[PDB]
């Protein structure tokens, strides 16, 4: 069969940068009888159904801007946007249909930011939470641009890395940064035997990790 | 023009036996084939198969050979899909796509809005709202961030708003992710430390799938 | 220009018009009486001898089943036809020997017994192995199964309606050959009347003379296929050391092929709207091979009198 592999899968384009997406397929998906080179690029803006952009890897569907141009042959294909405008944030898939229908991994787009200054904040479990028979310590990180970020929980100098739940924001349009939330869930009769519950955040904006200790 | 109408959201038990329909009224229904594409949340599209409504001939993916079963109805101009074998891992978003088919399906020029299918043990429950408040010896600062964590609500439709807070400005709502069968979501907003004691902030939660709109005001420790 | 089906459409009654059923029954009657009149000039001794030594039958099968589909596939690849056109020409190439080949061999007046034995054995071998060969030759075209769409009822009914008049003619000549004149004269008059009826009725049944909208190179390949079949049969028989009387019939049997099964398979696979002029393509192919055969008849009659 054919497995379709998209190279970048993540990049940031601000105002007019090229994109030069590429997916190399597996074998020659070029029909010799009809010089058509079966391939298609779909754009799926978040919360919407995918939309056709390019068909036969070179011809653009009526209704797309002139910015989206598709070029390639054989197994190497490329899609360029040129002047990336604001609403071009989506995921592109480059499906093939030469032998059997298969979609690509997908390429996501963001907007570049000058730098990130993540803000740390830790919270103890709620007063009525303990009465419910469980507890959960929560710390959420705000306003950091790069997606690669790590959070871990240190207790009395000992790491557990268990029962930790992570959630990410979706890059709100107000500013191209996005947040993160971390929750540690634990039942009753074991919360007060350790105390501590120190939070450490490691990010590329500073070599020294940001650590937040907790007492009582 | 042409538009493909899907059925609607489906919530079924892990006992399976669910069916999805895709009605298309913009063209001659027997000239094009109807595909079906499954998209898990944040895992990319995945082909399932298609049906040729003229001769009722179907082709399936190797993985989806056992489960999918595609039928078409010329009179009602709709194409169906039955799974009949569901697990907790099956819940995803299903689209129907129309392609021209001479000897090989060409490309998916038109898509449906999608059917969000959920597989779970059901037993919808009301949420419990736990306020968030710092003050355990912390020096705080120029601004303080607050939040309202919720626990144990099954249905997806829930929103958190800060009418007494900063409203839509400088507020972050983390999406909910499933765990232990009943999942949780969090919301966070920031307020200057000078204006927080002076003007209290209360967070209101709305759960349309239930009759619960409990409100409470967080208190500093 | 995107991908959209042709504007060609057909009347809703076309499926079950009384006129279409009348055309079908009149064609069946015509074929029955053609085969009766053409088996009235046969004998079982020579057909037994021909089946005993299958040299001509074997070369006919090889020329119709091993080389004809291959050259149809090569023509489809070289001429750069679409999927539908390539499948249509391939199915036309893989089809068995048509019944018109018997009449055409009678026009060439050569070895009718050998012609009938090869055409019946070729229809049988078509039923036997058209699916597998059409399957191996349809890689990259029609990802669907395509094995269950070729007619099998049609093939056996055609074989029966060809064998019955031939058997009647054989038995009648062997037992009591005394009503040859009256029966054959009545057959000729009824066949002329039936041909007139078919020609008049098809003019209003078919209609829509938009067949010229077919792309020119498809006409070119539908022209080359019967001629290459004729030439292939003639050359294969001649360079295989067979006599002149027994080689024209083999050549013109390999050249002439059935095309109604191509219509059935194309109409089962695709709607009349997805198929453009290829719906009337087999009718064009048949009349073109008829014209080519008439040209060969003229050449033969210009060589005979000189």
């Amino acid at each position: 069969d054919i497995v379709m592999t998209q190279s970048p899968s993540s990049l940031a384009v601000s105002a007019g940068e090229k994109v030069t997406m590429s997916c190399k397929s597996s074998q020659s998906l070029f029909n010799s009888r009809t010089r058509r080179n079966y391939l298609a690029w779909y754009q799926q803006k978040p919360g919407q159904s995918p939309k056709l952009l390019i068909y036969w890897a070179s011809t653009r569907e009526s209704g797309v801007p002139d910015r989206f141009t598709g070029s390639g042959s054989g197994t190497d294909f490329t899609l360029t946007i040129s002047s990336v405008q604001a609403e071009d944030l989506a995921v592109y898939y480059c499906k093939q249909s030469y032998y059997l229908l298969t979609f690509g991994a997908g390429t996501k787009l963001e907007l570049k930011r000058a730098d990130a200054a993540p803000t740390v904040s830790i919270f103890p479990p709620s007063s009525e939470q303990l009465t419910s028979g469980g507890a959960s310590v929560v710390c959420f990180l705000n306003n950091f641009y790069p997606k690669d970020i790590n959070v871990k929980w240190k207790i009395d100098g000992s790491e557990r890395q268990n029962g930790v739940l992570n959630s990410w924001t979706d890059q709100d349009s107000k500013d191209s940064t996005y947040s993160m939330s971390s929750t540690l869930t634990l039942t009753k009769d074991e919360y007060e035997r350790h105390n501590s519950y120190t939070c450490e955040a490691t990010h590329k904006t500073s070599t020294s990790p940001i650590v937040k200790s907790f007492n009582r | 023009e042409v538009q493909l109408q899907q059925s609607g959201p489906e919530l079924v038990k892990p006992g399976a036996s669910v069916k999805m329909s895709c009605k298309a009224s913009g063209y001659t229904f027997t000239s094009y084939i109807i595909h079906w594409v499954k998209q898990k949340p944040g895992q990319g599209l995945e082909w399932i198969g298609y049906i040729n409504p003229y001769n009722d001939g179907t082709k399936y993916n190797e993985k989806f050979k056992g489960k999918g079963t595609l039928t078409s109805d010329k009179s009602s101009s709709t194409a169906y899909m039955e799974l009949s074998s569901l697990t907790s891992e099956d819940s995803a978003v299903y689209y129907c796509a129309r392609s021209y088919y001479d000897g090989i399906p060409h490309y998916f020029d038109y898509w449906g809005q999608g059917t969000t299918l959920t597989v779970s043990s059901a037993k919808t429950t009301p949420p419990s709202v736990y306020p968030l408040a710092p003050g355990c010896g912390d020096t705080t600062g120029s601004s303080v961030t607050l939040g309202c964590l919720v626990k144990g609500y099954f249905p997806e439709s829930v929103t958190v708003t800060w009418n007494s807070g900063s409203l839509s400005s400088s507020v972050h709502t983390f999406p909910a992710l499933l765990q232990s069968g009943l999942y949780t979501m969090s919301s966070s907003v920031t307020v200057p430390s000078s204006t927080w004691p002076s003007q209290t902030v209360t967070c209101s939660v709305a759960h349309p799938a239930s009759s619960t709109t409990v409100d409470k005001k967080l208190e500093p420790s | 220009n995107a991908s959209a089906p042709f504007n060609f459409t057909l009347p809703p009654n076309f499926g079950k018009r009384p006129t279409d059923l009348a055309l079908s029954v009149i064609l069946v009657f015509m074929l029955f009486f053609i085969m009766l009149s053409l088996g009235c000039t046969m004998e079982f001794s020579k057909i037994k001898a021909h089946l005993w030594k299958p040299k001509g039958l074997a070369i006919a099968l090889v020329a119709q089943y091993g080389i004809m589909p291959l050259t149809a596939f090569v023509l489809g690849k070289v001429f750069r036809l679409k999927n539908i056109e390539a499948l249509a020409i391939l199915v036309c190439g893989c089809s068995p020997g048509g019944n018109l080949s018997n009449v055409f061999s009678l026009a060439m007046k050569g070895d009718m017994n050998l012609s009938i034995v090869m055409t019946t054995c070729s229809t049988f071998c078509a039923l036997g192995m058209m699916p597998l060969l059409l399957y191996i030759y349809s890689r990259g075209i029609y990802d669907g199964d395509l094995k269950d769409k070729v007619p099998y009822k049609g093939i056996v009914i055609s074989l029966v309606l060809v064998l019955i008049p031939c058997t009647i003619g054989i038995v009648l000549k062997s037992k009591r050959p005394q009503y040859m004149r009256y029966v054959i004269k009545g057959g000729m008059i009824i066949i002329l009347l039936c041909s007139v009826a078919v020609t008049v009725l098809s003019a209003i049944n078919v209609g829509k003379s938009i067949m010229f909208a077919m792309t020119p190179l498809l006409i070119a390949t539908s022209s080359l296929m019967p001629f290459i079949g004729f030439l292939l049969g003639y050359v294969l028989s001649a360079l295989f050391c067979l006599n002149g009387r027994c080689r024209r019939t083999v050549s013109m049997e390999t050249g002439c092929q059935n095309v109604q099964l191509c219509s059935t398979i194309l109409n089962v696979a695709f709607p009349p709207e997805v198929i453009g002029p290829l719906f009337f393509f087999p009718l064009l192919y048949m009349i073109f091979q008829l014209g080519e055969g008439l040209l060969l008849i003229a050449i033969f009659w210009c060589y005979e009198k000189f």
Side-chain angles (χ1 to χ4, degrees), chain C residues 177-242:
Chain C
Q178 306 153 4
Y179 287 166
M180 191 295 268
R181 199 178 200 271
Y182 289 91
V183 170
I184 299 299
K185 209 65 179 64
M188 186 66 204
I189 70 174
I190 194 164
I191 289 164
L192 188 153
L193 184 84
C194 183
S195 67
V196 169
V198 172
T199 315
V200 171
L201 192 152
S202 171
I204 60 171
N205 205 344
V206 167
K208 304 306 176 184
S209 59
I210 59 162
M211 294 182 286
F212 291 166
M214 185 180 288
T215 181
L217 78 165
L218 185 54
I219 291 170
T221 189
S222 69
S223 303
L224 189 153
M225 271 275 288
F227 178 73
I228 191 167
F230 286 138
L231 170 71
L232 188 153
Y234 181 77
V235 162
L236 199 42
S237 190
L239 265 68
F240 196 76
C241 278
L242 284 179

Side-chain angles (χ1 to χ4, degrees), chain A residues 35-49:
Chain A
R35 306 315 168 85
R36 260 179 182 162
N37 204 322
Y38 295 6
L39 199 79
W41 289 85
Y42 314 101
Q43 157 188 26
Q44 192 205 14
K45 293 171 70 65
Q48 301 193 11
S49 67

Side-chain angles (χ1 to χ4, degrees), chain A residues 41-101:
Chain A
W41 289 85
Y42 314 101
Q43 157 188 26
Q44 192 205 14
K45 293 171 70 65
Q48 301 193 11
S49 67
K51 165 186 136 187
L52 169 78
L53 289 182
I54 301 299
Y55 56 101
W56 312 135
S58 180
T59 65
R60 73 184 80 148
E61 179 67 23
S62 64
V64 302
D66 291 331
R67 304 184 272 94
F68 291 97
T69 75
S71 68
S73 165
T75 64
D76 189 2
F77 304 92
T78 316
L79 181 63
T80 81
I81 310 176
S82 313
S83 63
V84 175
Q85 185 213 340
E87 76 257 13
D88 292 348
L89 295 174
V91 184
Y92 307 82
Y93 286 101
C94 78
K95 177 262 289 179
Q96 64 88 19
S97 48
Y98 173 89
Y99 168 47
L100 192 64
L101 278 289

Side-chain angles (χ1 to χ4, degrees), chain B residues 28 30-32 50 52 54-55 59 98 100-107 109, chain C residues 2-5 83-84 140 142-144 149 267-274:
Chain B
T28 303
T30 60
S31 300
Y32 308 80
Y50 73 88
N52 194 355
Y54 178 91
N55 47 294
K59 184 160 273 282
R98 172 205 91 162
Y100 182 71
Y101 161 69
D102 70 19
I104 299 291
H106 285 167
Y107 52 86
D109 53 20
Chain C
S3 313
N83 300 294
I84 310 294
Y142 207 87
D143 53 353
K149 294 179 177 64
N267 294 137
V268 171
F270 310 119
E273 191 155 339
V274 171

Side-chain angles (χ1 to χ4, degrees), chain A residues 51-184:
Chain A
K51 165 186 136 187
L52 169 78
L53 289 182
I54 301 299
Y55 56 101
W56 312 135
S58 180
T59 65
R60 73 184 80 148
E61 179 67 23
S62 64
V64 302
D66 291 331
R67 304 184 272 94
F68 291 97
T69 75
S71 68
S73 165
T75 64
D76 189 2
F77 304 92
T78 316
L79 181 63
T80 81
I81 310 176
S82 313
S83 63
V84 175
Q85 185 213 340
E87 76 257 13
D88 292 348
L89 295 174
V91 184
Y92 307 82
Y93 286 101
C94 78
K95 177 262 289 179
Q96 64 88 19
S97 48
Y98 173 89
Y99 168 47
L100 192 64
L101 278 289
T102 46
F103 280 80
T107 302
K108 206 195 280 195
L109 281 71
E110 315 166 17
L111 282 72
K112 296 183 289 294
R113 292 212 52 250
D115 269 323
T119 68
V120 294
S121 179
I122 193 166
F123 293 90
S126 168
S127 168
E128 79 252 38
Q129 172 147 5
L130 277 298
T131 74
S132 304
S136 57
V137 55
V138 65
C139 67
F140 59 88
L141 294 174
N142 297 23
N143 291 356
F144 61 99
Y145 161 72
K147 214 203 171 193
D148 48 349
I149 190 167
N150 290 318
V151 62
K152 66 159 161 71
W153 297 85
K154 205 184 269 193
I155 297 89
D156 280 330
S158 179
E159 306 264 8
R160 65 191 323 291
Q161 282 99 21
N162 189 12
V164 187
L165 200 52
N166 298 331
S167 59
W168 275 276
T169 306
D170 209 359
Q171 184 178 2
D172 48 351
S173 179
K174 206 91 199 82
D175 48 355
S176 296
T177 190
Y178 39 92
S179 301
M180 171 145 188
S181 179
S182 176
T183 65
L184 159 60

Side-chain angles (χ1 to χ4, degrees), chain C residues 64 96-98 100-101 104 226 229-230 251-258 289:
Chain C
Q64 293 179 356
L100 178 74
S101 79
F104 270 52
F230 286 138
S251 181
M252 161 175 298
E253 175 69 30
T254 61
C256 297
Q257 292 162 331
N258 202 345
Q289 84 182 355

